[PDB]
Structure 1
Amino acid sequence: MKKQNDIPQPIRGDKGATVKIPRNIERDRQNPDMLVPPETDHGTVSNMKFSFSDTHNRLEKGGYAREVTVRELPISENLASVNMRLKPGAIRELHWHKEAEWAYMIYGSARVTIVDEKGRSFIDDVGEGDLWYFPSGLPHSIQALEEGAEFLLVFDDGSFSENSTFQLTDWLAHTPKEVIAANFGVTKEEISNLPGKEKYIFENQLPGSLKDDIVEGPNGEVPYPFTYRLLEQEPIESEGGKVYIADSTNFKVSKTIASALVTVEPGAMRELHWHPNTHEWQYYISGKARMTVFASDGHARTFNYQAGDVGYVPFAMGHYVENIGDEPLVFLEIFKDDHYADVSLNQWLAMLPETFVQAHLDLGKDFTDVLSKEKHPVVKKK
């Protein structure tokens, strides 16, 4: 708990030394638990942290998009992410991709379209705290409404790239005109004005009312919505914060992505736990955190995170997420699976015979008496 000097130094008790070479003081201040790790860290652990601020931002007329992929964070082979921004009325061009796409609306609102394997369309407006999920290969679009929009997209393969989606106008620009004309029963003259290259993101007038955009068709309505109002659900409320979970059990279409939004008050922490199903991918919406990843065989490494950072926890590794700042800590947890699952350290030990736990920990009834059989994902410090 000893605090750093204005110029922090990698010193812990009698270990470490001052930095003698030119250095990045600003980044060191953001990474206090990396410049000075806990004494309990040990061994080689892959990097589990990357900042969107350290990525190239693709700027277009109407917004921007930047990405963190396996080429930035190689531990995350199964999940990649885009931070995308749209100005009011601007359109993310009709497109599809091999990966399924999950999204969280951080700021503003947007209208999405999607058409399914049966030719059925779903059109809906998404606001702050809402999600969408587009299954692999189904074509979709996003158009920001009057406030603009900024959102996080997560794709279920780490090798994604935002520059490799299949765009409507790119497909047509690379199809012979004779074939397009034959496809639609029109003349080549009727399609002479098709774009010669993709748009990707483009400015446009605001759309009208949602009701006026709904398209009915001969194949009927989709069975399940492609959007979900996460923040309208009743959260799991612990002493130190709240957890909102959306997986395929409640957000029915979201078959390959399970998700949670976690809020952690100052002085609180997402408790010690692990996931018995799959890897965790993280996005930090706001606040400041540290997390130690316990990797087995005496290996553990602590990382720091703040707004704009991606984190990762490989399958079954022990972890916690501690708020280390004065404001709420808000982050997303993402899993490539059909459901969310964790094992809580506290609940695990609480559900075992007390003398058996005592025999393991070399602690007494004073400790086992504090264990809780109810899981409290976010705990508050006393």
Structure 2
Amino acid sequence: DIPQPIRGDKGATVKIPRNIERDRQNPDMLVPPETDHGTVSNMKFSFSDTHNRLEKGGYAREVTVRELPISENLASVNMRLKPGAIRELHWHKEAEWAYMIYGSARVTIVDEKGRSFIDDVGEGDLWYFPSGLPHSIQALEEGAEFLLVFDDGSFAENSTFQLTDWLAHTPKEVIAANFGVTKEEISNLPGKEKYIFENQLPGSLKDDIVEGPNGEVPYPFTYRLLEQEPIESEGGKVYIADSTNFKVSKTIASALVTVEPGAMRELHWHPNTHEWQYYISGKARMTVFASDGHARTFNYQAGDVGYVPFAMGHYVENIGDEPLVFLEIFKDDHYADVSLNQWLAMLPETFVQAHLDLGKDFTDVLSKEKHPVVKKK
């Protein structure tokens, strides 16, 4: 059918040419709750609304501060690799966090003491590469598709430092001197970057492990998130990875949230920093409460980026018939939330009643234990 921006006696039918498919995807934007009010920045952007860079071996598309200007500290790439295909040896200023949505991949990293780490990463696994440390990704037999987050919103995917691009713009006489070889011995070097290229599948992980004089890295750069025990509550599950458990992950804290149909990520805020969101599957709505009587509701579905500025109140409600699965990402060394429910449960009941003009029948339902995801009754 044909949705209209009408709420009781407010609003009207659209009379100009319009985008009905988009209107259908955004029911709480075309018809917001009556409780929404005031100017709030856009907190919503789709990867589908971005240019996709296509290469032999896969693709890469990004949502940055140029697409979503509220998110100045965090940016993201949706990258896809075909079986065997390689994301070229490269480095950047930004730390990089990743979540493997589909497939698997081999990563390499060498640290500033010349110690190497090589590991395979499967669905639900993470990696984190600290700023400036060089790395690669090679998809295994299924290919790979993953979400990357970089800890600067001004990140430009096209502007990373690539091995072959470095060498293509270094004098041949210097490269030859650097390695103790002749110019003729390096005449076959590529003339330009590769970036993403097709390649034969690698062999077993154990055969790739490189031994060196410098030791093992002190902490792994991968983490098996879904192998961890989640916080379990009535309507879903939360898996947290920050620097307290995934030790190397100093600038990125993360949680994978699953919300069953009829459930919601409860009313809460984060007392530490802004939240950046990626919707893996399902359909949600979220109201962002911006203080001073400002609040705005957004719709999200698979492929969307979301954002909640520092300390703004919010919830994420599943509004579909399938599980809602999304990531909460923070540029910090730890995850933290304040639960509205638990906060009030931990205060004298008469004081809460004095605030809410409600009685014992309300303060009796409050829980001193935090349940991040709650189920509707």
Same fold (TM over 0.5): yes
Cα deviation 1:307-357 (Å, max 9, x = unaligned):
000000000000000000000000000000000000000000000000000
Deviation at 1:8, TM superposition (A): 0.2
Q: Secondary structure at the match of 1:348?
A: helix
1:94 aligns with 2:89: yes
Q: Secondary structure at the match of 1:269?
A: strand
Paired with 1:123 and 1:99, the residues of 2 have a C-alpha distance of: 20
Deviation at 1:117, TM superposition (A): 1.2
Paired with 1:303 and 1:243, the residues of 2 have a C-alpha distance of: 22
TM-score norm. by structure 2 comes to 1.00
Aligned positions, number: 377
Structure 1 runs (4+) deviating above 2 angstroms are: none
Paired with 1:181 and 1:233, the residues of 2 have a C-alpha distance of: 49
Paired with 2:57 and 2:139, the residues of 1 have a C-alpha distance of: 10
Deviation at 1:365, TM superposition (A): 0.2
Q: Secondary structure at the match of 1:142?
A: strand
Paired with 2:343 and 2:128, the residues of 1 have a C-alpha distance of: 33
Paired with 1:156 and 1:217, the residues of 2 have a C-alpha distance of: 30
1:339 aligned to which of 317, 320, 334:
334
Deviation at 1:206, TM superposition (A): 0.2
Q: Secondary structure at the match of 1:245?
A: strand
Deviation at 1:135, TM superposition (A): 0.2
1:294 aligned to which of 281, 289, 292:
289
Deviation at 1:100, TM superposition (A): 0.2
1:167 aligns with 2:152: no
5+ long unaligned stretches in structure 1:
1-5
1:176 aligned to which of 159, 171, 181:
171
Q: Secondary structure at the match of 1:66?
A: strand
Cα deviation 1:43-73 (Å, max 9, x = unaligned):
0000000000000000000000000000000
In structure 2, what is the equivalent of residue 55 of structure 1?
A: 50
Paired with 1:87 and 1:81, the residues of 2 have a C-alpha distance of: 20
Paired with 1:217 and 1:245, the residues of 2 have a C-alpha distance of: 33
Q: Secondary structure at the match of 2:298?
A: strand
Deviation at 1:154, TM superposition (A): 0.2
What CA RMSD, in Å, does the superposition of the two structures yield over aligned residues? Answer: 0.2
Identity %: 100
Q: Secondary structure at the match of 1:151?
A: strand
Paired with 2:270 and 2:257, the residues of 1 have a C-alpha distance of: 16
Deviation at 1:237, TM superposition (A): 0.5
1:83 aligned to which of 60, 78, 90:
78
Cα deviation 1:246-288 (Å, max 9, x = unaligned):
0000000000000000000000000000000000000000000
Cα deviation 1:131-161 (Å, max 9, x = unaligned):
0000000000000000000000000000001
Cα deviation 1:144-194 (Å, max 9, x = unaligned):
000000000000000001100000000000000000000000000000000
Q: Secondary structure at the match of 1:104?
A: strand
Q: Secondary structure at the match of 1:34?
A: helix
Cα deviation 1:4-39 (Å, max 9, x = unaligned):
xx1000000000000000000000000000000000
Cα deviation 1:85-116 (Å, max 9, x = unaligned):
00000000000000000000000000000011
Deviation at 1:204, TM superposition (A): 0.2
TM-score norm. by structure 1 comes to 0.99
Paired with 1:179 and 1:160, the residues of 2 have a C-alpha distance of: 30
For residues 360-379 of structure 1, the aligned pairs below 5 Å read: 360-379=355-374
1:323 aligns with 2:292: no
Paired with 2:34 and 2:353, the residues of 1 have a C-alpha distance of: 25
Deviation at 1:305, TM superposition (A): 0.1
Paired with 1:232 and 1:320, the residues of 2 have a C-alpha distance of: 26
1:218 aligned to which of 213, 217, 230:
213
Deviation at 1:226, TM superposition (A): 0.1
5+ long unaligned stretches in structure 2:
none
